[PDB]
């Protein structure tokens, strides 16, 4: 602190209050716009409806094709290009099936080779995709 | 509204670093030599020592002849000697800081069973407690983490209902003797 007066507590508190708004983490957590733009709305997981499967081209040097799914929510109606987590799992997903979509772990930032996707699929048709890969569960058909 | 506790409390604290080579060497020494089961109870004795160390440190900050220091200092040293960890001629609050985690582990009943020599192995010592073959002051203890007091140390022996002691034979002895007599007729 610069001012060191014996009764400058309201000056020091106002400076710390104002300079907190210049912090990226404080302004994100204390503004309605950050929560408005979030499709989850503070939710850890959400259910959505598959309307199409979208292939996403990769970034600089590492080049491949990433398998994604355009997920449309039920609680908000917004559309999310969610990423299919593991290898060979797009054969598991079908059209017009409800999916449990969460984040991937970077908390609102595009992850690695995939451009513009922050979301991954956990459960499909109330059946876990991890057990589908392991063969522990079979899709009801 | 219900009348109950609602008091959940952890007895251990995980280390801040999970994957360092130095800590993995030290706790693995403590498990095999004293017959422990996992790293959780390794941290569980460290968490108890942290309470005693922190309670002693705030007493050193207090001035001498402080009646809070006089009463809490003597009450803390009463418990330390009576479990056989601190010497009675070493009864002073400033040697609590010099107490290590190596000293607590003998007063565990699993290690005291080996220290009294009635078990073949330190891991066999845990089996004898599990199978209720021993007793302390005419009371069977089924748990290896029993804290043996200084005055209760000499009363550890086999239980009355124990085939290893003066009791009825076990299931295997009844199984082997019955078919040995059944084969002969």
């Amino acid at each position: 602190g610069k001012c060191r007066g014996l009764r400058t507590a309201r000056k020091l508190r106002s400076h710390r209050r104002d300079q907190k708004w210049h912090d990226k983490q404080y302004k994100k957590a204390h503004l309605g716009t950050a929560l408005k733009a979030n499709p989850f709305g503070g939710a850890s997981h959400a259910k959505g409806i598959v309307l199409e499967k979208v292939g996403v081209e990769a970034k600089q040097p590492n080049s491949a094709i990433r398998k994604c799914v355009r997920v449309q929510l039920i609680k908000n109606g917004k559309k999310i290009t969610a990423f299919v987590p593991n290898d060979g799992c797009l054969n598991f997903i079908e059209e017009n099936d409800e999916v449990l979509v969460a984040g991937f772990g970077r908390k609102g930032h595009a992850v690695g080779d995939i451009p513009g996707v922050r979301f991954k699929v956990v459960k499909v048709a109330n059946v876990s995709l991890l057990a589908l890969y392991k063969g522990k569960k079979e899709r009801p058909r | 509204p219900v009348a109950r506790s609602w008091v959940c409390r952890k007895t251990y604290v995980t280390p801040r670093r999970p994957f360092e080579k130095s800590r993995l060497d030290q706790e693995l020494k403590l498990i095999g030599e004293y017959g422990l089961r996992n790293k959780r109870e390794v941290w569980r004795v460290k968490f108890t020592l942290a309470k005693i160390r922190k309670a002693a440190r705030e007493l050193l900050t207090l001035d001498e002849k402080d009646p809070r220091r006089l009463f809490e200092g003597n009450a803390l040293l009463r418990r330390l000697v009576r479990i056989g960890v601190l010497d009675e001629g070493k009864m002073k609050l400033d040697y609590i800081l010099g107490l290590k985690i190596e000293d607590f582990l003998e007063r565990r009943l699993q290690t005291q069973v080996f220290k009294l020599g009635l078990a073949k192995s330190i891991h066999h010592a845990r089996v004898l407690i599990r199978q209720r073959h021993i007793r302390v002051r005419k009371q069977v203890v089924n748990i290896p983490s029993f804290i043996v007091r200084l005055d209760s140390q000499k009363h550890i022996d086999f239980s009355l209902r124990s085939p290893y002691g003066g009791g009825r034979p076990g299931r295997v002895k009844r199984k082997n003797a019955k078919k040995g007599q059944g084969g002969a007729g």
């Binding site: 499967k53 292939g55 094709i65 060979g88 797009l90 054969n91 | 693995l28 498990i31 095999g32 891991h123």
Partner: protein, 55 residues
């Protein structure tokens, strides 16, 4: 395109999992781990080989 999903996993050759003795568990797992790390070693010069290191 989206046609090559499960391309490699489908064409990987299948090895059925072979049978082995079940590992000793409980505190016996840590008892087994303690002896072969500390008391079973001998003083040897050179680099100490890892538990899985094969060349």
């Amino acid at each position: 395109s989206l046609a090559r999903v499960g391309k490699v996993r489908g064409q990987t050759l299948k090895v059925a999992k072979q049978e082995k003795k079940k590992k000793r568990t409980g505190r016996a797992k840590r008892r087994m781990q303690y002896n072969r790390r500390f008391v079973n070693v001998v003083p040897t010069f050179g680099k100490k080989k890892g538990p899985n290191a094969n060349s």
